[PDB]
């Protein structure tokens, strides 16, 4: 997907993303929610999209108490047959803003 430079941004910032190789590593990426799409980049320069998600078909849920994935404040964006995004915020307030924005984009 392509980002429209003109479109307002609902939220952006760092999140850790778990990889999908099966070794379950994390990599810090810079995410941007614009329109109903999530984009991520190498860093906050927002130069060259490295990945993107069309959110209207996705469901996004927090992973809940207990740091089950080995870090706090994780949440999962999923839809069967589509790539799962496993994400971690740095704080609770961070988590709140992201879950709000992703919920609106997916509804």
From Swiss-Prot:
It is found in: Cytoplasm; Membrane. It comes from the Eukaryota. Residues 8-107 form the PH domain. Highly expressed in melanoma. Detected at low levels in heart, skeletal muscle, kidney, liver and small intestine. Binds specifically to phosphatidylinositol 3-phosphate (PtdIns3P), but not to other phosphoinositides. This is Pleckstrin homology domain-containing family A member 4. It comes from Homo sapiens (Human). The gene is PLEKHA4. The chain holds residues 47 to 153 of 779 of the full protein.
């Amino acid at each position: 997907l392509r980002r429209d430079p003109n479109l307002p941004v609902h939220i952006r910032g760092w999140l850790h993303k778990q990889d999908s190789s099966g070794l379950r590593l994390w990599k810090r990426r810079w995410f941007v929610l614009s329109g109903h799409c999530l984009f991520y980049y190498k860093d906050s320069r927002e130069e060259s999209v490295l990945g993107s998600v069309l959110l209207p078909s996705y469901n996004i849920r927090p992973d809940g108490p207990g740091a089950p994935r080995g870090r706090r404040f994780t949440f999962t964006a999923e839809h069967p047959g589509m790539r799962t995004y496993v994400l971690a915020a740095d704080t609770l307030e961070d988590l709140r803003g992201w879950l709000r924005a992703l919920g609106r984009a997916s509804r």
